[model samples]
Target: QKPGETKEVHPQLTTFRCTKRGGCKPATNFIVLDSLSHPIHRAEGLGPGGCGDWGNPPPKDVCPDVESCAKNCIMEGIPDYSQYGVTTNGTSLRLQHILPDGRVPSPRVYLLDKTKRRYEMLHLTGFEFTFDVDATKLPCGMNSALYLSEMHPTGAKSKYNPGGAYYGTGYCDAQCFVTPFINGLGNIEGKGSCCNEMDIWEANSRASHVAPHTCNKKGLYLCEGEECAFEGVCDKNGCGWNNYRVNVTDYYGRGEEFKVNTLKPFTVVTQFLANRRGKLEKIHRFYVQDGKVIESFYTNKEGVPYTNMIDDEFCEATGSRKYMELGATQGMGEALTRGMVLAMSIWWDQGGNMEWLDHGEAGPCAKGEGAPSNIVQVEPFPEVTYTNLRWGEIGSTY
Candidate 1:
């Protein structure tokens, strides 16, 4: 998907785009990276507890009797002057989410970058951006989840862990540990695809739920009575699908399921919409070869593809920002405005509708030479890339 913007300088406005794989194709995504929304909202930083007064407890010496730190996160040695840009007024930038079919979502974030000479996206996948119906208290939503990939590894062992403080067989579960990686269903045939229904499954509970990934094609996560409704905004009951996993490896013991949490944060709000539920369909695809499934290996096309549906992945923040400084200036870092990193993911869905192709293989491989081998190669699934970028933003929304 492509998310981009057009800037009006002289007589006409020129456009710039940020490209990622997914959605439509051959479209430029835009970012109207803005400055700060004045009265720069500041608090104690990212803590579950509330923020304290500047001069109150914690001793104002090493802590110094000062005003609240007008920054995002200040604890753990993080500083006050935002590394991105200074917070000022309104959205300094507005990133756009353009589909391959030239469709744009209602709410988007954007910003510009002087260095790259183009606008950029600031949020996606991992960035958790929750809105507040109540202006007084800040109510954030769930962290945006993006698919990195699905694969079957020989044995779970790695160093990097992106999903934060993860404790499983999958590496440190770090932000970018290279991969390795299922579900069940109804008895449609005779015994049915699944063993049971109405089961209170844990993380990777039902096996059938492992087929395909049902993203909010409309770009929303809504809530409903009991079932999840993909309402445009994430409300208390919207159909915001959280990432789940199933063990498809034989390296470990039997029936020993595992969950991999490698995500950033993406908010699902329930505001500014015709209805509360986000209209989304479930779609996923798996790599099945020789009647066996592989969940611990990554295909070459496992990152963010350069497409319209994902244009917003980039261009979230760019150009000179207010938070901190960049370039040769005191604010020389030119960090991405919000410093919000976007995470991504992809899942294989085996719904009843898709056309089933016949690759030479058995129905289900057994635990022998005919069984699914962990020796599966990394196929080129889609075209996606990993990156470490820093951007700058323009002034507040003009």
Candidate 2:
């Protein structure tokens, strides 16, 4: 949330329109939002300080509910995206840890539809999603993520919130974390959000993983203490297949030895296969680098062998009880049918030190090497770029 003078200048990002006949046409523009709000009520002496703080609720006197907040504190659009460390060259979007202007940008951008007013709803159950990423610059602590979450089409636009999705609102995930607002309204009670999450890619250059977390049921929801905990309303610890966590150190990493080397840009293609009943059955991953097609692999704790793909067998082998309890692939399949939004972000872990992702059995990293304090000093300007996004029929874009 910014001041009244904040100008609405949403940055322009692009996705691809792929087809068997079109061969992945480029230049589909999407507005980039910086996960912040711009209140229009600033002009009426009810500016930010009078309204509320960023990531906090507005005063009950000025904004009582979603309806009152929408009317009393209308919002403006983004002015300049560069200030937030986001840069786009049409189809390519780059996020940085520190810009030339000294701003450490940790923004999550949602792909907006063609009209630039709403989020682009993507249904990938029976299709494939492909994108090119350059993560060599990212370090061990950092996670440059491109994933899908079941968010509202209009950011929960209703008779109250006219700000809509254009402002980059309405975000829910399996983690069900608390936010400044809930469904475009003031979260006075400090509730969390819960929804199905398909983590297509969550990695830097050192390690990568593809995890799909689900909930007990469907639809966006406002959750609380117990409901947000493990084996509660959502699958907090998703069933994931990590390159290193699965015992494959020679697969994905920096340098030339790794099959899918991170030294250069590469295309990642993911397919969500459906069964005879039109339900999501399998999710597979592939990498196209140096004109070679590389498939993602997994090795059980017994070091059985290198296998590929995420199915019931893989989930059970990894002891993903939360995934199984939440209906496993069936729940994920149903959520896929409901449509999801593409959310991308670049961030480093401060609390957990990113051990769960890159330390222990997950990857090769020192105990405290992933601390944000160390990352900010050693690799002060980490960054990543995602380009050439194409999603369509199983084999159309690849």
Candidate 3:
């Protein structure tokens, strides 16, 4: 976009400031900034004379590079963000994937500090991130994800940008998806932003997993050539810890038969346990429903001990060589210590249909259960809502 012409409005998302003794207090701690890939008013679907398209290359003479395009075209700010399907209540944030008119905004939002100029860096080395979730309406082929990314705290604000974290500029993760812009500049060359990603939660009503995917590099970095490949510097498939992943059919489904019923809202607590040397050791998960704390446990079909947490040894034992080769929990642990930004989204993969998360052997569903067309035909309005985001010392949050 043109210099000094970025109009990105942020919706207010209230957070819970909690204390072990005093309970929790509502704080307008964060503002939601939609990702750059979302529809930006007239900015999307722009042709020749209009604003340049981000996903495709523009006319050679008109826009030779991002720098020239930044001056030649403009990305107008969105006045009303409600069309993107994001809303905030007292202390909850609700995100929807599809609009009524078949528009797949598929929003990916990041949390900005109260100042609206910096990302809310969550230094969660020995802390637990707790939240209440309502995913009963979320069906297959979708993921209501809450994770941390080692993105620039300032959104890599540059001289040509209008806002940094205020408008949600920088975003990178383990997926290494193509970014139309890098550090708020037009990425005319199709570059991918890379960084360490800790997927604290990726779930729906029928399934869930706590995993961490890390990158060889630190914060947001521009990946080139093979660096963006599947077996490159970034670890795509993480060492996931899940009860349903190991064939515990009665663990986390959507009814009373499941140990932790998904039909109702419940509290999810993920603890990042660090050893005495202040390094990450284990990633533990638990749940609280109806005043009952349900611990994490898992078992295979035949002969396997109960496993609840994910650690370096767990990754090695489970044959998650990608996670181990990329530094296992230690790589992600250092990222947590260095501080990372909190990001949330609800999306469905068009190609894979999220089969890796929940389909066939992953959770419990037929081979074709995750197709987006089938999901739309079955349950279209699968909005995901999250409430009471809390992060505190090991045992303080919840």
Order the numbered candidates by TM-score, best leading: 2, 3, 1
Which runs in model 3 stand beyond 4 Å of their true positions?
3-7, 38-61, 301-306
TM-score of 1: 0.19
Each candidate structure's TM-score, on Cα atoms with residue i matched to residue i, is 0.19, 0.92, 0.92
lDDT assessment of candidate 3? 0.78
lDDT of each: 0.18, 0.78, 0.78
Collision count of model 1: 158
lDDT per residue (tens digit) for residues 301-331 in model 3:
4433456678887677766788888888988
- RMSD of each candidate? 23.7, 2.5, 2.7
**Per-residue lDDT for 1-398 in model 1, tens only?**
00112222211112222222221122222221111111112233333332232112222222222221212212121122122221221322211122234432212112233322333334222211221111111001111122111111211122221111111111111111111110000001111000000001001111111111222111111122222222211111111111211113222111334222112111112111111232211111222222343232221122422221111121112111211110111110111122222222111222311111111111121222111121112111111111112111111000
Worst 10 residues of 2 by lDDT: 34-43
| lDDT at 116, model 2 | 72
lDDT of 2 by residue, 1-398 (tens): 22234556766766777888878776566756634534335336554544555545666876666556555655566677776777788788888877766677677788888787788888888899999999888778898899988888888876555556777778888988776566667666667878999999999888887899989867688887798778588998899888787777889888899998898999999999999788988899989997788876657557333468888777876788889888898789889889998898888878888787788888887899898878767677888999888898888887
Number of the candidate with higher TM-score, 1 or 3: 3
Candidate 2 lDDT (Cα, 0 to 1): 0.78
Better of 1 and 2 by TM-score: 2
Q: Which stretches of candidate 1 lie over 4 Å from their true place?
A: 1-27, 33-108, 111-234, 243-281, 285-398
